[PDB]
From a paper:
The gram-positive bacterium Cutibacterium acnes (formerly Propionibacterium acnes) belongs to the phylum Actinobacteria, and is one of the major inhabitants of the sebaceous follicles of the human skin. In this work, we propose a degradation pathway for the cytoplasmic path of host N-glycans by C. acnes, as well as a detailed structural and functional characterization of the exo-β-1,4-mannosidase, a member of glycoside hydrolase family 5 subfamily 18 (GH5_18), that catalyzes hydrolysis of the β-1,4-glycosidic bond between the second N-acetylglucosamine and the first mannose residue in the canonical eukaryotic N-glycan core. The amino-acid sequences of exo-acting β-mannosidases (EC 3.2.1.25) are found in any of the three GH families 1, 2 and 5, which belong to the GH-A clan that features the (β/α)8 TIM-barrel fold. These enzymes follow a retaining reaction mechanism according to the classical Koshland double-displacement mechanism where two conserved glutamate residues act as acid/base catalyst and nucleophile.
The crystal structure of CaMan5_18 was determined and refined in the unliganded state at a final resolution of 1.8 Å. The crystals belong to space group P21 with four molecules in the asymmetric unit, and an approximate solvent content of 50%. The overall structure displays the, for GH5 enzymes typical, (β/α)8 TIM-barrel fold. The enzyme was co-crystallized with mannose, however, no clear density for the sugar could be identified. Furthermore, we were unsuccessful in capturing a complex of CaMan5_18 with mannose, probably because a disordered MOPS molecule is present in the active site of the crystal structure. Although the experimental data do not show bound ligand in the active site, we can derive from close homologs that Glu140 is acting as the acid/base catalyst and Glu259 as a nucleophile. The conformation of Glu140 is supported by interactions with His215, and the neighboring Asn139 is kept in position through a possible hydrogen bond with Arg41. The orientation of the catalytic nucleophile Glu259 can be stabilized through interactions with Arg41 and Trp217. The enzyme is present as a two-fold symmetrical homodimer in the crystal, featuring an extensive dimer interface generated by five loop regions: L1 (residues 46–57), L2 (residues 89–92), L3 (residues 98–102), L4 (residues 152–156), and L5 (residues 299–314), where especially L2 and L3 shape and stabilize the active site (inset). The C-terminus in our CaMan5_18 structure (residues 396–408) is flexible and lacks interpretable electron density.
Residue numbers in the entry:
A (entry chain B): 1 to 392
B (entry chain A): 1 to 395
């Protein structure tokens, strides 16, 4: 199994793209490579790549490639998220899609034409770099359709289920057309798993792109319900992956745990190492799991304001570049993770019913319901991750 | 009076701040100064200056100073709009003020603290350039409070009349604290003159900052009502300036026609020279008028998409730098404009009733109303710009 990090530049965070300092980048990647990690996930900014729909900036693309080549110096494999878009509570949107220029980020024909232009130019650059493996359409881009009572986007783009599929096929198809050897994905917060009317569905997750992705974040629901120190905190990503496996009709469908982390809302600094060890140990046996990518590489500088406070301390390194206790715990897990001892599950899968075409009824799997509490209870008592099963 | 241009970079428009090519900037400013123009208005981009509330980028400030000094090489006076903010239908907003981070651009205490920080660092840099004269708060920044039926901002910030005053006093106060020798202004679209419940009022306009500013655009209302070729199109800026004079209780209050232009919705290319000369002739006698600034210096490149189409052709120059017919017409008017022969107006001012404290009733002055129609009628009949007079309503 591959083990890597979501790259959050220590100097400048993603605002570093405006004043790119490749030697500072190299010091970040040296640290990541020193831990034993083998890949990073990169996040270029949409307003810098494409400040007007007809202006895809060549120097912005040059900057992306410089960072790709810096990672290659330290033998780090790279994937790039194309449309960011959304990062750590902030939306990076070019002026031609906001306020007076509002349209629909999933169905407006000119917006889609701009998105495919940017994605095509990115893919044409990235296919030439030997350590670049592929692209994700954008970081949790489906949140621009979020409509849940506790998480609904303030300038939401209306979108049907079929609209969502057509948008994915357009973006992923453009990547494939320009970069046939690449692998391509989309990623999303867990509204896709848990919100019945969310237009991006589990069907989309297990059928579009090269692997099913999961982002696993316990601070919104799992932590509030179950609390600090509870086992559900460390079983959550395995649960999400078993849910992804339950939804798939293909036993060969690979999985990528593209985001997982330890929010200090419910995992104190002094529990972080143990959280890293317990979480990682419960993932090694996951069938089909190709990679785990930690959020994030480096603490966000406290000189940057207005983040939700949990975002600042998600790094494996402090902002000054010092490895944190969970960083060393991760290095120790790398042999077990690389080898990934399969365990063939002979359990009785916990069943749930939910609609394939529409995603209706998927809220039965929510961390607030009985099914997840029962899953965690059985995983703790047996020590073995239960399978899940979607009634046919 | 002074005559200048709102600077719209030919190579890349305002997106040129990301890839600043000072030799391209020199080429634009050379054309502007060759015409006889003596100043420019500059628009730095808020997301570039302050991508995070805690990060005012010194390299972005350096780039602003570089353009100020490039204009000094052609003896061009400079003012800088601090918070942009709004430019030609586009909003340039840092991520920390939008969507999940939405607050209030006029009343949120942390937003204001961020705004004053940026304004202070800008003022501190600009006060050391000899050709920099002052700053405007931001281009038409009150449009973030717009609430009119035909013009309401889709993510508007709720704001009272007193909120508006407090915000201006905070921003303008910061500029004066850091740059005592400077002159400072705010500018606005004509909602301030014409929309009864717009929280920025004519009272604010004639009392805050160093001079009353006017932006004069005929495409939204004057053109549609009166049509191509009508005299109302060329009288409109003088009307607005006489309205500004009427609201002011101070005869010494200066005026700045900070934006005026010739939109092709109602002024064809082949009418632009005549529009320029007629408009400018009706302005030379305006009491207190210190400067006129044309929107804009250079046509927007058609390689840039999704602009309202009228925005592309507002330049004095084509995008590749050829002077347009109105540019040469303006160059001829320059002796008459520098000399600015005053005229004592001995007329009976046309009266209107509106509220000084709240701005209520100011819509009687709208280009859709009878007052503006009679003003134009009398101006055409006599050849003299009529004065206006405010009768303050009780409350």
């Amino acid at each position: 199994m591959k083990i890597g990090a979501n790259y959050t530049p220590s100097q400048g965070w993603f605002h570093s793209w405006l004043d790119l300092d490749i030697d500072a980048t190299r010091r970040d990647f040296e640290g990541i490579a020193q831990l034993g990690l083998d890949h990073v996930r990169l996040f270029p900014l949409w307003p810098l790549l494409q400040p007007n729909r007809g202006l895809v900036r060549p120097r912005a693309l040059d900057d992306v490639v410089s960072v790709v080549r810096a990672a290659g110096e330290f033998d780090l494999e790279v994937t790039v998220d194309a449309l960011n878009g959304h990062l750590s509570s902030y939306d990076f949107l070019p002026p031609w899609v906001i306020t007076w220029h509002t349209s629909n980020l999933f169905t407006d024909p000119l917006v889609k034409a701009g998105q495919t232009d940017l994605i095509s130019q990115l893919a044409t650059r990235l296919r030439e770099e030997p350590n670049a493996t592929g692209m994700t359409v954008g970081n949790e881009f489906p949140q621009y359709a979020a409509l849940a009572p506790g998480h609904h986007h303030p300038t939401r783009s209306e979108c049907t289920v079929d609209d969502a599929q057509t948008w994915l096929e357009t973006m992923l198809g453009t990547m494939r057309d320009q970069w046939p050897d690449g692998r391509f994905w989309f990623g999303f917060d867990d509204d896709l798993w848990f919100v019945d009317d969310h237009p991006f569905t589990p069907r989309h997750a297990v059928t579009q792109g090269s692997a099913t992705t999961v982002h696993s974040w316990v601070f919104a629901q799992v932590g509030p319900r179950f609390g600090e120190g509870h086992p559900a905190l460390t079983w959550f990503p395995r649960y999400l992956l078993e849910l992804a496996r339950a939804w798939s009709h293909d036993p060969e469908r690979p999985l990528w745990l593209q985001e997982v982390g330890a929010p200090r809302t419910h995992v104190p600094d002094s529990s972080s190492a143990a959280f890293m060890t317990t979480t990682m140990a419960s993932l090694t046996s996951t069938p089909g799991l190709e990679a785990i990518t930690w959020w994030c590489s480096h603490d966000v500088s406290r000189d940057l304001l207005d983040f939700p406070e949990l975002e600042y301390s998600l790094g494996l390194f402090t902002n000054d570049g010092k490895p944190k206790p969970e960083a060393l715990a991760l290095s120790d897990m790398l042999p077990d993770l690389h080898n990934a001892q399969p365990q063939h599950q002979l359990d009785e899968p916990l069943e749930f019913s939910a609609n394939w075409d529409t995603g209706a009824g998927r809220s039965v799997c929510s961390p607030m319901g009985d099914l997840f509490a029962q899953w965690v209870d059985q995983a703790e008592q047996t020590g073995r991750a239960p399978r899940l099963a979607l009634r046919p």
